[PDB]
Structures are given as C-alpha cells and as structure tokens.
Amino acid sequence: PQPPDILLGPLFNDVQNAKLFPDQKTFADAVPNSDPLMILADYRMQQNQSGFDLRHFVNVNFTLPKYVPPEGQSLREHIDGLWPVLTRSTENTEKWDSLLPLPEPYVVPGGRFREVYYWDSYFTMLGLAESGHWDKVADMVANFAHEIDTYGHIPNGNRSYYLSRSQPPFFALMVELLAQHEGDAALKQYLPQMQKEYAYWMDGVENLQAGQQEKRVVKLQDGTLLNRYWDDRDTPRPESWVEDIATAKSNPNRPATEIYRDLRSAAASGWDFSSRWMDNPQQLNTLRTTSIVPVDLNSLMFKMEKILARASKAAGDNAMANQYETLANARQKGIEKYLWNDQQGWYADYDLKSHKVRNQLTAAALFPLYVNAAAKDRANKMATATKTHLLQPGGLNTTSVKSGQQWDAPNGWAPLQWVATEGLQNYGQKEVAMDISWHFLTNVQHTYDREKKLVEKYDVSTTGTGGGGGEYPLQDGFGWTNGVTLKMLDLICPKEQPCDNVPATRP
Ligand SMILES: OC[C@H]1O[C@H](NC2=N[C@@H]3[C@H](S2)[C@@H](O)[C@H](O)[C@]3(O)CO)[C@H](O)[C@@H](O)[C@@H]1O
C-alpha cells in the first residue's frame, strides 16, 4: 500500500495545499474512483488549462469520507450502547483506499478517527472485557496479530499513511488481557507475533555501537539499550500536510526533514503534540522527539520483555524465557539509571543531546509504576509528585505546562488516568489512585450530564468540559474514554451495588 502523497503525487500535494477541506485528514482518506495513474495523467492535461477547477476535479475523481442518548440514559448504558456505533468491519476495501483491510470487526475512537488505533485499542479493550464482550477483545487481538504478520509491526492505525510508524506498544498487554479470560493459551497462541513485534522495536541493535541510534533503538555510551519513537519517513504527514509544511517553514535553522521526522515520531509516541518533546513549549517547530528516550516507551518495552518471558515459559521454551528475563532486568536497570531524575524526584525522559535526564514532570512518569519496574521508594516519591503537581480537580494533568498543544495542561487523557491509577495501586498508593479515578470520573460524568457524550480529552482544572489544543478539534465518542470510564466505574462502586452513573458521594 502506497500512502496517498506517493500514490497521488502532485495532485495530493495540490489538493491539500488548496485547503479544499477543513481537515487535512479528509483528503488523506479519499478513495480514488479510478486508477491513480489515469487520474494523474488527466490532471496533468487539465491543470494548466484556462478555467480548470480543482474542487470539481476532486469531486469527479474521488469519493470522500461520509447521536443523542435517550432521556435519562445512564453513563454505563450510553457507553454499552455506543460500541456498535464505534465498530467498523473492513475485511476488504475498494481499490486504492488508504484504509487497510483487517480480518475482524474493530472499534475506532470516534469522529475523524475512522480507523483502528494501536494504543487506544488497549484501553478500549479493557472496557469491552469489563462488559463481557470478550469476543470483540479476541477479534481485536487477532486484528493486531494480523497486522504484525502482514506489515511487521502494528501501524499507528490501519491506514497507508500510518505504515511508516507504530504507536505506544500495548500488544503484549492486549495478549495478557486476553489471557485473563482464556488463560495461558492466549499467551502461547500469540507468542510468535509478540516476538515479531519485539524484533521490530529492536531492529538495528545488531551492529549498533555505544552512543549510536538506529531506527527505534538507542545504545547509550555505557552500552545500555533503550528504545525511542521513530517514523521511517522524513516528509510531511499526509494527514496533516499543510500543518507540517508550515511548521518546518517556520524554522529555517533546522533541516525540514529533521522537523518532519520529529513530528512523525511524536505521532508515533501517541503524544502529538506536547511540550514534553519541545525545547520551547510555545514553538512546535522546536520539537525533537527522536533525540528523547521516552520513559513510557521504555516502561512498555520492559513489560513486553516480561510478558515474552512469561509466554515463553508457558510454552515450554526455557532458554527463551531466561533470555527475556535477562533482557527485562537490563531494561529495568536502564530505566532506573537513565529515566529517573534524582534532583527533582521523579521519572522522566532522557536527553540524547545533553546526555542528561530531562527535568520536566509529565504523566509518562507513572509508567514505571504501571509496569512494576519502579523501586518502591521511587514509587512513593511518584505518589507525592502526582499529588503535588499533577492531580487536579477533574483528573490527572498530562503536564504542568499550558503550551496550546493537546498533550499538556490543562488536558487529562483517559489512558494516562488509568496508567496512573493502576501504577499507584501496584505500590499500594490507594488514596492517590482513588482520587485520580474519582476526579476523572466526576469530569466524565459532569461532561456527559451537560453534553450527552464522552469526548477525547478533558479539562482537568474543573469538571464538565472537554479539552482542546493542537491541530484539530476535540473529538467525540470516544473509544479509550469509554473503556477507561467502565473500568473506573467498577473500581469506585461495590459491584454488590454497582453504579451506572458516577455518584456524588463515595460509597
Ligand atoms: O491529526 C493527525 C494525527 O491524528 C492522530 N493523533 C491523535 N489522535 C488521538 C491521540 S493524538 C492519540 O494518542 C490516539 O491514537 C487518538 O486518541 C486517536 O487517534 C494520529 O494518531 C496521528 O498519527 C496523526 O498524525
């Protein structure tokens, strides 16, 4: 599958640059009505002719992409009822569609996100599992396994323009989730695809020397092996074409290709975009994702290694189980050395430019707790950092910096709420965990009471309003919000007396 900027070459660039559609993703999802080679030749003939109209040419040659709860419907009921609305089934696609086929139905986030997304799906699957839709969980794992075998990795989503990258790696955790229902059979079944995904993340370690980086692998000067986010292309994102061109244009002191690589790699991080990656929080054109070793990614790699060990052991391959534990142990040592800021007292990303742990506290700092990599003293310090700096009245803040980007204050994102809660639980920090859950759930409920929907991210400074920021508007649905809300709704009420709306009083 060739991404649309390649498939449709100059025409793609021209349509995007013309801003015919208010979202650059719209034309990225256009389906050619005939062979792109024919369309391009026709366009070449017409484009310089007197009276040529690009919009009419597009309308001819492409097909462009195409609810309110009943009175008193509870939050839980609304969520359960929305799953089919968010479910898509594309076993086959029309020719030249940027949508990539998947063997089973899948849940998409909502709104402009009309394809499956990698890390969203984990948190969506937690909700599907909580509500007994294990068939759909199994379908999703199967879909991702298929993507691993077909492409060698899980793309950011099932679009041609996402093949160049992945997203935060949750597939091993998806397999572990499935094994909560199916037992170790699930780990053993999908061991081949977990190993294949690990091969993707680690591709480049062979022949890598200390102080070098290759693709998603970094080897520090002392030999420590860690991963980073990394897209295989260094061109504007087809789905955000004009944005990326404008971002690069705005900073002539950097090569455009480096800015494009870093924009794409921030998309791969899931955190498109954030002060977390930026020298200057007020200028996206200073982002330097590929020079930053992320604490979340490396926590997820540790978990992947641990799960690979567990699956290998279950399968009866002891040499591979031992090897993976050895790898995990090395990873954990790397996290504790290079991804802990001892001056500030929190986990943090590592800076390959300055060769120093970064100073900024972000919600990614809870990931070492979430995966049980953290020392207990450091987990307790993280509980304190969370209470002091990140816990707000409406949930866990993503960062403390209001940059105008969406992965930043004052926005709270469902997945980060859950990672934090679960990480804190893993170290017995139940009070802070419950406050995050209650505060965020109150936000979700309040917003639902007012707007009759769940949304992509929330303003945690108060309750009852969705968040904003970045290059597109707040989206509605919303897969991981719905999934995390269900999980948290179960944590907060007895279950001998389960709640269908978030109560005003803690049981
Ligand atoms: O506006 C274009 C971008 O849209 C997506 N970006 C984001 N979408 C939501 C956030 S940020 C991400 O972490 C999740 O996957 C998301 O909830 C759904 O896609 C996509 O993942 C990125 O790869 C795209 O470049």
Side-chain angles (χ1 to χ4, degrees), residues 1-65 67-70 72-94 96-429 431-494 496 498-507:
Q2 282 320 299
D5 63 310
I6 306 313
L7 190 53
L8 294 157
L11 175 60
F12 183 79
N13 169 77
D14 294 350
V15 172
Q16 292 297 59
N17 289 350
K19 302 187 192 185
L20 300 187
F21 311 108
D23 188 347
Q24 295 275 292
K25 192 171 180 289
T26 292
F27 194 66
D29 296 342
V31 185
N33 293 335
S34 66
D35 192 327
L37 293 181
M38 302 190 335
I39 295 171
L40 290 172
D42 186 15
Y43 180 61
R44 180 60 186 79
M45 285 304 301
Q46 297 202 39
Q47 64 184 132
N48 299 137
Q49 285 173 167
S50 185
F52 175 72
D53 187 75
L54 185 58
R55 179 179 295 279
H56 182 256
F57 183 85
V58 170
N59 295 344
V60 174
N61 288 287
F62 298 83
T63 301
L64 301 182
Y67 291 150
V68 189
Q73 197 179 223
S74 68
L75 181 59
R76 191 186 284 280
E77 288 176 317
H78 172 72
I79 290 168
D80 293 337
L82 267 194
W83 296 126
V85 173
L86 294 173
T87 296
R88 305 280 177 279
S89 171
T90 151
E91 295 183 8
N92 333 278
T93 51
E94 293 281 6
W96 307 296
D97 200 336
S98 61
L99 191 66
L100 305 173
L102 286 177
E104 314 298 338
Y106 52 92
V107 179
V108 303
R112 72 196 291 262
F113 301 123
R114 45 189 169 250
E115 52 281 323
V116 86
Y117 281 79
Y118 184 5
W119 72 320
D120 301 57
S121 292
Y122 176 72
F123 295 91
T124 307
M125 289 153 80
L126 290 174
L128 288 165
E130 181 282 340
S131 40
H133 301 282
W134 288 102
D135 51 340
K136 294 184 66 74
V137 178
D139 284 351
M140 291 295 257
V141 177
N143 279 334
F144 288 123
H146 168 81
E147 293 191 310
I148 292 160
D149 281 340
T150 302
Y151 309 119
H153 68 275
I154 298 162
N156 182 333
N158 64 315
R159 293 278 178 184
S160 58
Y161 54 80
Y162 290 148
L163 289 170
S164 56
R165 59 173 175 276
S166 192
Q167 246 193 348
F170 276 80
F171 180 70
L173 289 75
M174 295 174 182
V175 175
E176 273 213 329
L177 171 63
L178 186 60
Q180 292 171 16
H181 190 237
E182 297 187 5
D184 282 2
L187 295 170
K188 300 181 285 186
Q189 177 177 357
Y190 289 111
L191 177 56
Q193 293 80 13
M194 294 190 288
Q195 292 183 316
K196 186 169 285 171
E197 200 205 4
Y198 185 65
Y200 167 82
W201 287 97
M202 302 317 295
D203 184 12
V205 61
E206 193 182 344
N207 206 44
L208 200 60
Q209 309 301 314
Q212 299 191 331
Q213 313 80 48
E214 175 65 31
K215 295 180 259 294
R216 299 147 298 269
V217 192
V218 308
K219 200 164 177 185
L220 301 183
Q221 287 175 346
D222 73 357
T224 298
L225 289 165
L226 294 168
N227 294 89
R228 58 170 181 190
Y229 293 114
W230 181 267
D231 189 276
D232 296 333
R233 299 186 74 189
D234 62 358
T235 51
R237 286 173 296 153
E239 72 284 8
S240 298
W241 189 257
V242 301
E243 290 89 359
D244 287 358
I245 290 170
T247 301
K249 170 178 179 61
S250 74
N251 193 357
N253 296 147
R254 294 179 74 185
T257 51
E258 293 178 1
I259 292 172
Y260 298 144
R261 184 89 68 181
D262 281 333
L263 287 163
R264 290 168 158 277
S265 295
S269 79
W271 290 47
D272 43 304
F273 295 100
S274 180
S275 59
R276 182 178 175 198
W277 317 120
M278 291 148 75
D279 297 335
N280 184 347
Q282 307 311 322
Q283 294 289 336
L284 183 59
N285 72 23
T286 67
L287 98 164
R288 51 180 185 84
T289 323
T290 61
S291 71
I292 298 166
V293 181
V295 61
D296 47 7
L297 171 57
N298 284 284
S299 294
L300 292 166
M301 297 302 305
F302 171 76
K303 189 64 179 200
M304 187 189 303
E305 288 158 336
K306 291 291 293 184
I307 293 170
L308 282 160
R310 177 190 175 194
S312 298
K313 177 175 180 174
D317 196 335
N318 296 144
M320 294 289 292
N322 283 343
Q323 165 64 149
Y324 290 124
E325 290 295 349
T326 296
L327 291 165
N329 290 344
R331 176 86 58 174
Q332 178 181 40
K333 288 174 193 160
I335 294 163
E336 293 290 49
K337 185 161 180 63
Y338 290 100
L339 300 167
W340 170 258
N341 190 311
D342 201 59
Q343 182 194 60
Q344 303 303 324
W346 50 65
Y347 289 101
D349 304 316
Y350 183 75
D351 197 318
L352 295 174
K353 197 183 196 186
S354 62
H355 301 93
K356 295 171 187 182
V357 188
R358 293 171 62 100
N359 289 326
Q360 184 174 197
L361 177 59
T362 84
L366 283 300
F367 273 72
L369 284 66
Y370 177 63
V371 304
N372 277 77
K376 293 169 173 161
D377 68 317
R378 288 178 178 193
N380 290 347
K381 288 188 179 283
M382 282 314 306
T384 298
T386 296
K387 282 184 288 188
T388 297
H389 299 296
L390 294 176
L391 179 60
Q392 296 290 335
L396 188 79
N397 229 341
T398 301
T399 74
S400 300
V401 175
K402 308 173 171 288
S403 67
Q405 303 304 325
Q406 65 176 348
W407 292 86
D408 266 315
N411 291 340
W413 293 79
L416 299 176
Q417 317 296 128
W418 183 251
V419 168
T421 298
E422 283 295 277
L424 288 160
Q425 285 292 346
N426 285 339
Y427 291 79
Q429 293 281 351
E431 293 288 340
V432 181
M434 299 302 81
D435 285 357
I436 295 164
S437 297
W438 272 103
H439 289 195
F440 185 68
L441 276 176
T442 299
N443 208 340
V444 171
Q445 185 79 47
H446 188 178
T447 307
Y448 175 76
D449 294 341
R450 279 205 51 96
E451 311 299 339
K452 284 68 169 186
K453 60 188 182 188
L454 286 79
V455 299
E456 177 188 22
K457 64 268 184 171
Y458 292 79
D459 184 328
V460 302
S461 69
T462 62
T463 61
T465 68
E471 69 193 3
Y472 62 85
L474 175 68
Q475 300 293 301
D476 301 339
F478 192 84
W480 54 28
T481 302
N482 297 18
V484 167
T485 295
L486 294 177
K487 287 297 291 178
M488 293 186 164
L489 271 186
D490 289 8
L491 174 292
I492 57 146
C493 300
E496 70 234 33
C499 44
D500 289 351
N501 296 289
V502 181
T505 312
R506 296 148 84 123

